[PDB]
């Protein structure tokens, strides 16, 4: 088990056919989780499960440029369960990130930041016990 917040280095950034796997367990009274794929201070892809926005569970995705959040993309399909182990897989494709949770497709997010090979860090934070974070080429 790792300590959160955790930084996974992505040296040489990301590239199509890269598969990033995050394994953990949601804490029993969880409020939020965040993955932040970063290009310096910019957040190319923010993936933000919210467990209690208006007694609603929702996943918010966005990009932060020059410390300004852009237009949100939201997904109400919500595969995370408090207390339960999860696997997030982020597959990099030429035109978007493709996200699956527990082996089921969840969402896609088109690339707004285009220099994939400079998205050189993944920050993992929030209300989880983080077991491992790694990547490979499929
Ligand atoms: O767009 C994505 C961003 O959303 C904003 S909230 C946004 O605020 C708008 C007005 O500016 C409203 O109009 C929108 O409706 C509403 O969604 C979040 O604060 C922003 N964030 C989330 C997080 S971690 O959870 C987190 C990190 C540290 C401590 C605790 C939690 N770190 N940064 C991001 O998720
Ligand atoms: Mg496409
Ligand atoms: Mg498309």
From Swiss-Prot:
GO molecular function: carbohydrate binding; chemoattractant activity; disaccharide binding; IgE binding; laminin binding; molecular condensate scaffold activity; protein phosphatase binding; protein phosphatase inhibitor activity
Subunit architecture: Probably forms homo- or heterodimers. Interacts with DMBT1. Interacts with CD6 and ALCAM. Forms a complex with the ITGA3, ITGB1 and CSPG4. Interacts with LGALS3BP, LYPD3, ZFTRAF1 and UACA. Interacts with TRIM16; this interaction mediates autophagy of damage endomembranes. Interacts with cargo receptor TMED10; the interaction mediates the translocation from the cytoplasm into the ERGIC (endoplasmic reticulum-Golgi intermediate compartment) and thereby secretion.
Entry keyword set: Acetylation, Cytoplasm, Differentiation, Disulfide bond, IgE-binding protein, Immunity, Innate immunity, Lectin, mRNA processing, mRNA splicing, Nucleus, Phosphoprotein, Repeat, Secreted, Spliceosome
Protein's cellular compartments: Cytoplasm; Nucleus; Secreted
Record PTM Phosphoserine, positions in chain: 76
Parent-record interval covered: 113 to 250 of 250
GO cellular component: cell surface; collagen-containing extracellular matrix; cytoplasm; cytosol; extracellular exosome; extracellular region; extracellular space; ficolin-1-rich granule membrane
Lineage of producing organism: Eukaryota, Metazoa, Chordata, Craniata, Vertebrata
Keyword Mitochondrion appears in the UniProt entry: no
Organism per entry: Homo sapiens
Protein's name according to its UniProt entry: Galectin-3
Alphabetical GO biological process terms: eosinophil chemotaxis; epithelial cell differentiation; innate immune response; macrophage chemotaxis; monocyte chemotaxis; mononuclear cell migration; mRNA processing; negative regulation of endocytosis
């Amino acid at each position: 088990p790792l300590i959160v917040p955790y930084n996974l280095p992505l040296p040489g950034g990301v590239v199509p056919r890269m598969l990033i796997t995050i394994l953990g367990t949601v804490k029993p009274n969880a409020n939020r989780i965040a993955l932040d794929f970063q290009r310096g201070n910019d957040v190319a892809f923010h993936f933000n499960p919210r467990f209690n926005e208006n007694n609603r569970r929702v996943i918010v995705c966005n990009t932060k440029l020059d410390n300004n959040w852009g237009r949100e993309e939201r997904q109400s399909v919500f595969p995370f369960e408090s207390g339960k182990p999860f696997k997030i897989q982020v597959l990099v494709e030429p035109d978007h990130f493709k996200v699956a949770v527990n082996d089921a497709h969840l969402l896609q997010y088109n690339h707004r930041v285009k220099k994939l090979n400079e998205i050189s860090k993944l920050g993992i934070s929030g209300d989880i016990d983080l077991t491992s974070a790694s990547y490979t080429m499929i």
